[PDB]
Amino acid sequence: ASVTEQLRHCSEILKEMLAKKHFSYAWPFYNPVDVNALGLHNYYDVVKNPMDLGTIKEKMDNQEYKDAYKFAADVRLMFMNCYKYNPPDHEVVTMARMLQDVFETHFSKIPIE
Ligand SMILES: CC(=O)Nc1cc(NC(=O)c2ccc3c(c2)c(-c2ccc(N)cc2C)nn3C)ccc1C
């Protein structure tokens, strides 16, 4: 479990989160929340550190993650932003949790801290 091998598995996890099979619930998370289109103008009063898969993929491609756990922190931040902002019963929370189930299932293969 070198850091290279771990970062390689994190790239595979991200590819899986962006894969076609999950599009039906992952699409709200591909790009920054479109606050202006949706009219969610209190979003930035609640969420001070936005994150989305496109941002994570740009960081991964730029070699910006030093280890698997910094990658995990950014992925989990994207999900926590959704859970912090949206009502727990909301449809986008259901979609977020489905995408998180994909992440957590695969991230379970990464050695602990
Ligand atoms: C404090 C507050 O007002 N909460 C709140 C929020 C909602 N939410 C929506 O109405 C909504 C509709 C379509 C939406 C979203 C949210 C999001 C979204 C937003 C943020 C994050 N982080 C991730 C995602 C995927 N994407 N799409 C396509 C409704 C009622 C309340 C009271």
Numbering used by the authors: 266 to 378
Quote the paper.
Interestingly, truncation from CDD-1102 to compound 20 (herein called CDD-1302) showed no loss in activity despite the loss of >100 g/mol molecular weight. The overall structure of four molecules in the BRDT-BD2/CDD-1302 crystal was nearly identical except for a short segment of the ZA loop (residues 305 to 308). In two of the BRDT-BD2/CDD-1302 complexes in the crystal (molecules A and B), an arginine residue (R341) from the neighboring molecule in the crystal interacted with N307 and the bound CDD-1302 through hydrogen bonds. The additional CDD-1302 molecules bound at molecules C and D showed several contacts with other protein molecules in the asymmetric unit mediated through Jeffamine ED-2000 and ordered waters. As mentioned, a segment of the ZA loop containing H306 and N307 moves away slightly, and this allows the side chain of N307 to move closer to CDD-1302 for a new hydrogen bond with the terminal amide oxygen.
BRDT is a tissue-restricted BET subfamily member expressed in pachytene spermatocytes, diplotene spermatocytes, and round spermatids.
